[PDB]
Coordinates of C-alpha atoms in Angstrom, one line a residue:
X674 CA 185.0 146.4 390.9
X675 CA 183.3 144.6 388.1
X676 CA 180.0 144.8 389.6
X677 CA 179.9 148.7 389.8
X678 CA 181.2 148.7 386.3
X679 CA 178.5 146.5 385.0
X680 CA 175.9 148.3 386.7
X681 CA 177.2 151.7 385.7
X682 CA 177.5 150.8 382.1
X683 CA 173.7 149.5 382.1
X684 CA 172.8 152.8 383.6
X685 CA 174.7 154.9 381.2
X686 CA 173.4 152.8 378.3
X687 CA 169.6 153.3 379.6
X688 CA 170.1 157.1 380.3
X689 CA 171.6 157.5 377.0
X690 CA 168.7 155.6 375.2
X691 CA 166.1 157.5 377.3
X692 CA 167.4 160.8 376.4
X693 CA 167.4 160.0 372.6
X694 CA 163.8 158.5 372.7
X695 CA 162.5 161.3 374.9
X696 CA 163.8 163.7 372.3
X697 CA 162.2 161.9 369.4
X698 CA 158.8 161.3 371.5
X699 CA 158.7 165.0 372.1
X700 CA 159.2 165.8 368.6
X701 CA 156.6 163.3 367.4
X702 CA 153.8 164.3 369.6
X703 CA 150.2 162.9 369.7
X704 CA 149.3 159.7 368.2
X705 CA 146.0 161.5 367.0
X706 CA 147.6 164.8 365.9
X707 CA 150.3 166.0 363.4
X708 CA 150.6 164.0 360.3
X709 CA 147.4 161.9 361.3
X710 CA 145.5 165.1 361.2
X711 CA 147.1 166.3 357.9
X712 CA 146.0 162.9 356.3
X713 CA 142.4 163.3 357.8
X714 CA 142.1 166.9 356.4
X715 CA 143.4 165.9 352.9
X716 CA 140.6 163.2 352.6
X717 CA 137.9 165.6 353.9
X718 CA 139.0 168.2 351.5
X719 CA 138.4 165.8 348.6
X720 CA 134.8 165.3 350.1
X721 CA 134.2 169.1 349.5
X722 CA 135.4 168.5 346.0
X723 CA 133.2 165.8 345.5
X724 CA 130.1 168.0 346.2
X725 CA 131.6 171.0 344.1
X726 CA 133.5 169.0 341.5
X727 CA 133.9 171.9 339.0
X728 CA 134.8 174.5 341.6
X729 CA 138.2 176.0 341.4
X730 CA 138.3 177.0 345.0
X731 CA 137.6 173.7 346.5
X732 CA 140.3 172.2 344.2
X733 CA 142.7 174.9 345.4
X734 CA 141.9 174.1 349.1
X735 CA 142.5 170.3 348.6
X736 CA 145.9 171.1 347.1
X737 CA 146.6 173.3 350.2
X738 CA 145.8 170.3 352.0
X739 CA 148.2 168.3 350.1
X740 CA 151.0 170.8 350.6
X741 CA 150.2 170.8 354.3
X742 CA 150.8 167.0 354.5
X743 CA 153.9 167.1 352.3
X744 CA 155.6 169.7 354.4
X745 CA 155.2 167.6 357.5
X746 CA 156.1 164.4 355.9
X747 CA 159.3 166.1 354.3
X748 CA 160.1 167.8 357.6
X749 CA 159.7 164.5 359.3
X750 CA 162.3 162.9 356.9
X751 CA 164.9 165.7 357.9
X752 CA 164.1 165.3 361.7
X753 CA 164.7 161.5 361.5
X754 CA 168.1 161.9 359.4
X755 CA 169.1 164.8 361.7
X756 CA 168.8 162.4 364.7
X757 CA 170.5 159.7 362.7
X758 CA 173.3 162.0 362.2
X759 CA 173.3 163.1 366.0
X760 CA 173.8 159.5 366.7
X761 CA 176.8 159.3 364.3
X762 CA 178.5 162.2 365.8
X763 CA 177.9 161.1 369.3
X764 CA 179.3 157.7 368.4
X765 CA 182.4 159.5 367.1
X766 CA 182.9 161.7 370.3
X767 CA 182.2 158.4 372.4
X768 CA 185.0 156.6 370.7
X769 CA 187.4 159.6 371.0
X770 CA 186.7 159.6 374.8
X771 CA 187.1 155.8 374.9
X772 CA 190.7 156.1 373.3
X773 CA 191.6 158.8 375.7
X774 CA 190.7 156.5 378.8
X775 CA 192.2 153.4 377.4
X776 CA 195.4 155.1 376.7
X777 CA 195.5 156.6 380.3
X778 CA 194.9 153.2 381.9
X779 CA 197.7 151.7 379.8
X780 CA 199.9 154.6 380.7
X781 CA 198.9 153.9 384.6
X782 CA 199.4 150.3 384.4
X783 CA 203.2 151.1 383.5
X784 CA 203.4 154.0 385.9
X785 CA 202.1 151.8 388.9
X786 CA 204.4 148.8 388.0
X787 CA 207.3 151.1 387.7
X788 CA 206.5 152.5 391.2
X789 CA 206.3 149.0 392.7
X790 CA 209.8 148.5 391.1
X791 CA 201.5 154.7 395.0
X792 CA 197.8 154.8 396.2
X793 CA 197.2 157.9 394.1
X794 CA 198.0 156.3 390.8
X795 CA 195.7 153.4 391.8
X796 CA 193.0 155.8 392.2
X797 CA 193.6 157.6 388.8
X798 CA 193.4 154.5 387.3
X799 CA 190.1 153.5 389.0
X800 CA 188.5 156.7 387.9
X801 CA 189.5 156.2 384.5
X802 CA 187.9 152.8 384.4
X803 CA 184.8 154.3 385.8
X804 CA 184.6 157.0 383.2
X805 CA 185.2 154.5 380.4
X806 CA 182.5 152.1 381.7
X807 CA 180.0 155.0 381.3
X808 CA 181.1 155.2 377.6
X809 CA 181.1 151.3 377.0
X810 CA 180.5 148.1 378.5
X811 CA 183.9 146.9 379.8
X812 CA 185.1 144.1 382.0
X813 CA 188.6 144.7 383.8
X814 CA 190.8 141.6 384.8
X815 CA 193.8 141.7 387.4
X816 CA 197.4 140.5 386.0
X817 CA 200.3 141.3 388.1
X818 CA 198.9 144.3 389.4
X819 CA 198.0 145.3 385.7
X820 CA 194.4 146.0 384.5
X821 CA 193.8 144.4 381.3
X822 CA 190.6 145.8 379.9
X823 CA 188.1 144.3 377.4
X824 CA 184.8 145.4 375.9
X825 CA 182.1 143.2 377.0
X826 CA 182.1 141.3 373.7
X827 CA 185.8 140.4 374.1
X828 CA 187.6 143.1 372.3
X829 CA 190.6 144.1 374.1
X830 CA 191.1 147.7 375.1
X831 CA 194.1 147.6 377.5
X832 CA 196.5 144.8 377.8
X833 CA 199.4 145.8 380.2
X834 CA 201.0 148.9 378.9
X835 CA 199.6 148.9 375.5
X836 CA 195.9 150.1 374.5
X837 CA 194.0 149.4 371.5
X838 CA 192.3 152.2 369.3
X839 CA 188.6 152.2 368.2
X840 CA 187.3 154.1 365.5
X841 CA 184.0 154.8 363.8
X842 CA 183.6 154.3 360.1
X843 CA 180.8 154.1 357.7
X844 CA 178.8 150.8 358.4
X845 CA 179.2 148.1 355.7
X846 CA 175.4 147.7 355.5
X847 CA 174.4 151.4 355.7
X848 CA 176.8 154.2 354.7
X849 CA 174.4 156.8 356.5
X850 CA 175.4 155.1 359.7
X851 CA 178.5 154.8 361.6
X852 CA 179.9 151.6 363.2
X853 CA 182.4 150.9 365.6
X854 CA 185.9 149.2 364.6
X855 CA 189.1 148.2 366.1
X856 CA 192.3 149.2 364.4
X857 CA 194.6 147.0 366.4
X858 CA 196.9 148.4 369.1
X859 CA 197.5 152.1 369.2
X860 CA 200.3 153.7 367.6
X861 CA 201.1 150.9 365.1
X862 CA 202.7 151.0 361.8
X863 CA 200.1 149.7 359.2
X864 CA 197.2 148.8 361.4
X865 CA 196.2 145.2 360.7
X866 CA 192.7 144.6 359.0
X867 CA 190.1 146.8 360.4
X868 CA 188.0 144.7 362.5
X869 CA 184.2 145.3 362.4
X870 CA 182.5 144.9 365.8
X871 CA 178.9 144.1 365.5
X872 CA 176.4 146.6 366.9
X873 CA 174.8 144.1 368.9
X874 CA 177.8 143.0 370.7
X875 CA 178.7 146.5 371.8
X876 CA 176.4 146.8 374.9
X877 CA 176.9 149.1 377.7
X878 CA 177.6 152.7 378.1
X879 CA 176.8 155.5 375.8
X880 CA 177.8 153.3 373.0
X881 CA 175.2 150.8 373.7
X882 CA 172.5 153.2 374.4
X883 CA 173.3 155.1 371.2
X884 CA 173.2 151.9 369.1
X885 CA 170.0 150.5 370.9
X886 CA 168.2 153.7 370.1
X887 CA 169.1 153.5 366.5
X888 CA 168.3 149.9 365.7
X889 CA 165.3 149.3 368.1
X890 CA 163.5 152.9 367.9
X891 CA 164.8 155.3 365.3
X892 CA 165.2 153.1 362.3
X893 CA 162.1 151.2 362.7
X894 CA 160.1 154.6 363.4
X895 CA 161.3 156.0 360.2
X896 CA 160.6 152.8 358.2
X897 CA 157.0 152.8 359.8
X898 CA 156.5 156.4 359.1
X899 CA 157.8 156.0 355.6
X900 CA 155.3 153.2 355.1
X901 CA 152.4 155.4 355.6
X902 CA 153.7 157.9 353.2
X903 CA 154.1 155.2 350.6
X904 CA 150.7 153.8 351.1
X905 CA 148.9 157.2 351.2
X906 CA 150.7 158.0 347.9
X907 CA 149.9 154.8 346.2
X908 CA 146.4 154.7 347.1
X909 CA 145.6 158.3 346.1
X910 CA 147.3 157.8 342.9
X911 CA 145.6 154.5 342.2
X912 CA 142.2 155.9 342.9
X913 CA 142.9 159.2 340.9
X914 CA 143.8 157.1 337.9
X915 CA 140.1 155.7 338.0
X916 CA 138.5 159.1 337.7
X917 CA 138.6 161.7 334.9
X918 CA 139.6 165.3 335.1
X919 CA 138.2 168.5 334.0
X920 CA 139.0 167.7 330.5
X921 CA 137.5 164.3 330.7
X922 CA 140.9 162.8 330.5
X923 CA 142.1 160.1 333.0
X924 CA 143.4 161.2 336.2
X925 CA 147.1 160.9 336.8
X926 CA 149.3 160.7 339.9
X927 CA 148.8 163.5 342.7
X928 CA 151.7 162.4 344.6
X929 CA 155.3 160.8 344.2
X930 CA 158.0 159.3 346.3
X931 CA 161.6 158.1 345.8
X932 CA 162.4 154.4 345.2
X933 CA 163.4 151.9 347.8
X934 CA 167.2 152.2 348.9
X935 CA 169.4 149.3 348.4
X936 CA 173.0 149.0 349.5
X937 CA 175.4 146.3 348.6
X938 CA 177.2 145.2 351.7
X939 CA 180.8 146.3 351.7
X940 CA 181.8 142.8 352.6
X941 CA 180.5 141.5 349.1
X942 CA 182.9 139.6 347.0
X943 CA 180.4 139.2 344.0
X944 CA 179.3 142.0 341.6
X945 CA 175.6 141.6 341.4
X946 CA 173.3 144.7 341.9
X947 CA 169.8 144.6 343.6
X948 CA 166.7 146.5 342.7
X949 CA 163.6 146.4 344.8
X950 CA 159.9 147.3 344.2
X951 CA 156.5 146.7 346.1
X952 CA 154.3 143.9 345.2
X953 CA 151.6 146.3 346.2
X954 CA 152.5 149.8 346.8
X955 CA 149.3 150.3 348.8
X956 CA 150.4 147.8 351.4
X957 CA 154.1 148.4 351.5
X958 CA 156.6 146.8 354.1
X959 CA 157.1 148.5 357.4
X960 CA 160.8 147.5 358.2
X961 CA 164.4 147.3 357.2
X962 CA 165.8 144.3 355.3
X963 CA 169.0 142.5 354.4
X964 CA 168.8 139.9 351.5
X965 CA 171.6 137.4 351.8
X966 CA 172.8 134.7 349.6
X967 CA 174.5 131.5 350.8
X968 CA 175.3 130.0 347.6
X969 CA 172.1 128.0 347.2
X970 CA 169.3 130.4 348.4
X971 CA 168.3 133.8 349.3
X972 CA 167.1 134.8 352.6
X973 CA 165.4 138.0 353.6
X974 CA 166.0 139.2 357.2
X975 CA 164.3 141.7 359.3
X976 CA 167.4 144.1 360.3
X977 CA 165.5 145.2 363.6
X978 CA 164.6 141.8 364.8
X979 CA 167.1 139.6 363.2
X980 CA 164.1 137.3 362.2
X981 CA 164.0 135.5 359.0
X982 CA 160.9 136.9 356.9
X983 CA 161.3 134.5 354.0
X984 CA 163.6 132.6 351.5
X985 CA 163.7 132.1 347.8
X986 CA 165.4 130.0 345.3
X987 CA 164.5 131.3 341.9
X988 CA 165.6 129.5 338.9
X989 CA 165.3 132.5 336.6
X990 CA 168.1 134.3 334.8
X991 CA 168.6 136.9 335.8
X992 CA 167.4 136.2 339.3
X993 CA 163.9 137.5 340.3
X994 CA 162.1 136.7 343.4
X995 CA 159.2 137.7 345.7
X996 CA 159.5 137.7 349.5
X997 CA 157.5 139.4 352.3
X998 CA 155.6 141.9 350.2
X999 CA 158.8 142.7 348.0
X1000 CA 159.8 142.0 344.4
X1001 CA 163.6 141.6 344.5
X1002 CA 165.7 141.7 341.2
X1003 CA 169.2 140.8 340.9
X1004 CA 171.6 141.5 337.9
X1005 CA 173.1 138.1 338.4
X1006 CA 173.5 135.6 341.1
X1007 CA 175.7 136.9 344.0
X1008 CA 178.6 135.0 345.5
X1009 CA 178.0 133.1 348.6
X1010 CA 178.2 135.5 351.8
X1011 CA 177.0 138.4 349.7
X1012 CA 174.4 140.7 351.3
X1013 CA 172.1 143.7 350.3
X1014 CA 170.5 146.1 352.7
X1015 CA 166.9 146.9 351.5
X1016 CA 165.3 149.9 353.0
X1017 CA 162.0 150.0 351.0
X1018 CA 160.3 153.0 353.0
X1019 CA 162.9 154.8 355.0
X1020 CA 163.5 157.2 352.2
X1021 CA 160.0 157.8 351.2
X1022 CA 159.7 160.8 353.4
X1023 CA 162.5 162.8 351.9
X1024 CA 161.3 162.7 348.3
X1025 CA 157.6 162.9 349.3
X1026 CA 155.9 165.6 347.1
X1027 CA 152.8 166.6 345.1
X1028 CA 153.2 165.2 341.5
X1029 CA 151.2 168.3 340.6
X1030 CA 149.7 171.4 342.5
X1031 CA 147.2 172.2 339.8
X1032 CA 143.7 171.5 341.3
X1033 CA 142.4 170.6 337.9
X1034 CA 144.6 167.4 337.9
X1035 CA 142.0 165.9 340.8
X1036 CA 139.8 163.5 339.0
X1037 CA 136.6 164.2 340.6
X1038 CA 134.5 162.4 337.9
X1039 CA 133.7 158.7 337.1
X1040 CA 134.8 157.9 333.5
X1041 CA 131.6 155.8 332.9
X1042 CA 127.9 156.7 333.1
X1043 CA 125.1 154.0 333.1
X1044 CA 121.6 155.4 332.6
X1045 CA 118.0 154.4 332.0
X1046 CA 116.7 155.4 328.7
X1047 CA 114.0 158.0 329.0
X1048 CA 111.4 156.2 327.0
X1049 CA 111.4 153.2 329.4
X1050 CA 108.0 152.5 331.1
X1051 CA 108.9 149.9 333.6
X1052 CA 110.4 150.3 337.0
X1053 CA 114.0 149.2 336.2
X1054 CA 116.6 151.4 338.0
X1055 CA 120.4 151.2 337.1
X1056 CA 123.0 152.7 339.2
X1057 CA 125.5 155.3 337.7
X1058 CA 128.2 152.7 337.4
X1059 CA 131.7 152.5 338.5
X1060 CA 135.1 151.3 337.3
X1061 CA 138.1 149.3 338.6
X1062 CA 141.9 149.0 337.9
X1063 CA 142.5 148.5 334.3
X1064 CA 139.1 149.6 333.1
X1065 CA 138.4 150.1 329.4
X1066 CA 135.4 151.9 327.9
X1067 CA 134.7 151.1 324.1
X1068 CA 134.0 154.3 321.8
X1069 CA 130.6 153.7 321.5
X1070 CA 127.5 153.7 323.7
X1071 CA 126.5 150.2 324.9
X1072 CA 122.6 149.5 325.4
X1073 CA 121.2 146.7 327.2
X1074 CA 117.7 145.8 326.5
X1075 CA 115.4 143.7 328.7
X1076 CA 113.3 140.8 327.2
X1077 CA 110.3 140.3 329.5
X1078 CA 109.2 136.9 328.0
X1079 CA 112.6 135.4 328.6
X1080 CA 113.5 137.8 331.6
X1081 CA 117.0 138.3 330.2
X1082 CA 119.2 141.4 329.3
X1083 CA 121.1 141.5 326.0
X1084 CA 123.1 144.0 324.1
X1085 CA 126.6 143.5 325.9
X1086 CA 129.7 144.1 324.1
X1087 CA 131.1 140.9 322.3
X1088 CA 134.2 139.3 323.9
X1089 CA 133.1 140.5 327.5
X1090 CA 132.3 138.3 330.4
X1091 CA 129.5 139.3 332.6
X1092 CA 129.5 138.4 336.2
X1093 CA 126.5 138.7 338.3
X1094 CA 127.3 139.0 342.2
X1095 CA 125.7 136.1 344.3
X1096 CA 126.4 133.4 346.7
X1097 CA 127.9 132.1 344.6
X1098 CA 128.4 134.5 341.7
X1099 CA 127.9 133.4 338.1
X1100 CA 129.6 134.5 334.9
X1101 CA 128.4 134.4 331.3
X1102 CA 130.6 134.8 328.2
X1103 CA 129.0 137.3 325.8
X1104 CA 129.6 136.3 322.2
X1105 CA 127.2 138.4 320.4
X1106 CA 125.0 141.3 320.8
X1107 CA 122.1 139.1 321.5
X1108 CA 123.8 136.7 324.1
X1109 CA 121.3 136.7 327.0
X1110 CA 122.1 137.5 330.7
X1111 CA 119.4 136.4 333.2
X1112 CA 117.6 139.0 335.2
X1113 CA 115.4 138.4 338.4
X1114 CA 113.3 141.5 339.0
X1115 CA 112.7 139.9 342.5
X1116 CA 116.4 140.1 343.3
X1117 CA 117.9 142.7 340.9
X1118 CA 121.5 142.2 339.6
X1119 CA 124.9 143.6 340.5
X1120 CA 126.9 143.2 337.3
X1121 CA 130.6 143.4 336.4
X1122 CA 131.6 143.5 332.7
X1123 CA 135.0 142.3 332.1
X1124 CA 137.1 141.5 328.8
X1125 CA 137.0 137.7 328.5
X1126 CA 140.4 137.8 327.4
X1127 CA 142.9 139.1 330.0
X1128 CA 144.6 141.5 329.8
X1129 CA 141.9 143.4 327.8
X1130 CA 142.7 143.9 324.1
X1131 CA 142.1 147.5 323.0
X1132 CA 138.5 148.4 322.4
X1133 CA 137.1 145.8 324.8
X1134 CA 134.9 146.9 327.8
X1135 CA 136.7 146.0 330.9
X1136 CA 136.2 146.8 334.7
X1137 CA 132.8 148.2 334.4
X1138 CA 130.3 147.5 337.3
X1139 CA 126.6 148.3 337.3
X1140 CA 123.6 147.5 339.3
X1141 CA 120.1 147.0 338.2
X1142 CA 117.0 146.6 340.3
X1143 CA 113.2 147.0 339.6
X1144 CA 111.1 145.6 336.8
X1145 CA 111.9 146.8 333.4
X1146 CA 109.1 146.6 330.8
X1147 CA 109.7 144.7 327.8
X1148 CA 112.2 146.5 325.5
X1149 CA 113.3 148.9 328.1
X1150 CA 116.8 150.0 327.8
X1151 CA 119.9 150.9 330.0
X1152 CA 122.9 152.6 328.5
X1153 CA 126.6 152.4 329.5
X1154 CA 129.3 154.8 328.0
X1155 CA 131.7 157.5 328.8
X1156 CA 130.8 160.2 331.3
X1157 CA 130.1 163.6 330.2
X1158 CA 130.2 164.5 333.0
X1159 CA 131.6 167.9 333.8
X1160 CA 130.8 168.2 337.3
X1161 CA 130.4 164.6 338.3
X1162 CA 132.1 163.9 341.8
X1163 CA 131.9 160.2 342.4
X1164 CA 135.6 159.5 342.0
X1165 CA 136.4 162.6 344.5
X1166 CA 133.8 160.7 346.7
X1167 CA 135.9 157.5 346.4
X1168 CA 139.1 159.3 347.1
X1169 CA 137.8 160.8 350.2
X1170 CA 136.7 157.4 351.6
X1171 CA 140.3 156.2 351.2
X1172 CA 140.7 157.4 354.8
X1173 CA 138.7 154.3 355.9
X1174 CA 140.7 151.8 353.8
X1175 CA 142.7 149.2 355.8
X1176 CA 146.0 148.9 354.0
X1177 CA 148.5 148.8 356.9
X1178 CA 149.4 145.7 359.1
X1179 CA 148.1 143.0 356.6
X1180 CA 144.9 144.8 355.8
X1181 CA 143.7 145.4 359.4
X1182 CA 144.5 149.2 360.1
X1183 CA 143.9 152.6 358.4
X1184 CA 146.6 155.1 357.8
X1185 CA 145.8 157.1 360.7
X1186 CA 145.3 153.9 362.8
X1187 CA 149.0 153.0 361.6
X1188 CA 150.1 156.3 362.4
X1189 CA 148.9 156.0 366.0
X1190 CA 150.8 152.7 366.4
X1191 CA 154.0 154.2 365.1
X1192 CA 153.7 157.0 367.6
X1193 CA 152.6 154.8 370.6
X1194 CA 155.7 152.6 369.8
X1195 CA 157.9 155.6 370.5
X1196 CA 155.8 156.8 373.5
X1197 CA 155.7 153.3 375.1
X1198 CA 159.4 153.0 374.9
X1199 CA 160.1 156.4 376.3
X1200 CA 157.7 155.9 379.4
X1201 CA 159.5 152.4 380.0
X1202 CA 163.0 153.9 379.5
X1203 CA 162.1 156.6 381.9
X1204 CA 161.3 154.3 384.7
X1205 CA 164.1 151.7 383.8
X1206 CA 166.8 154.6 383.8
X1207 CA 165.5 156.3 386.8
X1208 CA 165.8 152.8 388.8
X1209 CA 169.3 152.0 387.3
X1210 CA 170.7 155.4 387.8
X1211 CA 169.5 155.5 391.3
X1212 CA 170.9 152.0 391.9
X1213 CA 174.1 153.0 390.4
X1214 CA 174.2 155.9 392.8
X1215 CA 173.8 153.7 395.7
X1216 CA 176.7 151.2 394.5
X1217 CA 178.8 154.0 394.1
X1218 CA 178.2 155.3 397.6
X1219 CA 178.7 151.9 398.9
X1220 CA 182.2 151.7 397.3
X1221 CA 183.2 155.2 398.4
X1222 CA 182.5 154.2 402.0
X1223 CA 184.7 151.0 402.3
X1224 CA 187.5 150.5 404.4

């Protein structure tokens, strides 16, 4: 009966989904262990460097921590792709069995009708339908004693004494994933245009369980874990670039990842190509997307939920746009109906690596040093200074001098703008060595020195911050210049504190906090599916026993 069929197919779907997510969950483990622990350990390793900035051993240990993390992230990429391929193989096996059963049912339709021209054939056919519903959601309908059989979505499988063949082929939106198609009636000369059955329509049975696991658990999980890798690499790289190495040279990258993955949908009629980057690599996207064009606008859709994330109507040629954290660039305007799969973070794991394993490449020192001049007689105290993205240090020493009569500092570099923090902050354009900046000893001053012209022309001080407190005497001086600097660890300290940065979920969660969410999504799915599956399998068992006991 169609009631048992529906219940059975839901049960097979749930148990298939459960088995797969349970496998993933067992693999991923604790939300506060594994990769989260490797990340924590990497940053605490850099704290050790911060206190021993010249020590070769501390740097070697830090690099071993990096290698440990990379090993886990890369192995994670392999596990996700292995599961993804396991789904591919099971989809194909499932389709082979489906074709076997549909052919059997068509054969039985003919054999039964020929006999009525046989209770045992009636049974063989019913058992076939049973077996079939465990593989896919099917609905049967009577017709002159025949069984017509249809996929829940409408696709015929059996019509009288003919059957339809399904196949797996590479999906038009993602060639790493197989999708189900119909090739028309079985045995045909030149099968008519291959019909792409939408994953979402293919509910029930092993089919539906496989597909739901893939789109709702597996692919999101890899996108999320990939996003952590990208954010980690981007943050560490950006902070290392703010320090100097053992040779006093600017830090370079410590980690690298591959670029986003983009597929032109196989249904495309235009010839445009798409490339994608992050607006901010430290805050990457966490899902999978499709960019589609309808002849007037571009839409970015989340592939897991189907929800629109944003639209764009660029006028640029060639077309460039920004949507939902992504910079999207096309070589030309696509045709209406064209689509591109955009996977910004799935592949980050497979390419994750140390850009260098040389411990000397860790830029532990600050590039800048601010200092009180030793002849000062007052109580002025300046911080050691710090730099931000795109800082520049002129070749010479900058010497600030305090004038007690006017209570001002001067000696700033020409062409800079000095911003004093406050509520609100105030800014002063420096136009000569004597341009004064107000200083209140009762309040002190936190100052940022930026190039007035942006971006900064060569040789102009930019991105330098210093704080002054206390009461300088008249003529007291404070210098700002390149750090030297051989065992300074201010930047290693900054690197180590990246562990507390909130770069995920719109600036609300840390890397390890985001890792815990990624694990818990999998864990929560598994525990719910365990109960849902147990309940449904039990019920299917009961309906089966009921049917086996009828008159």
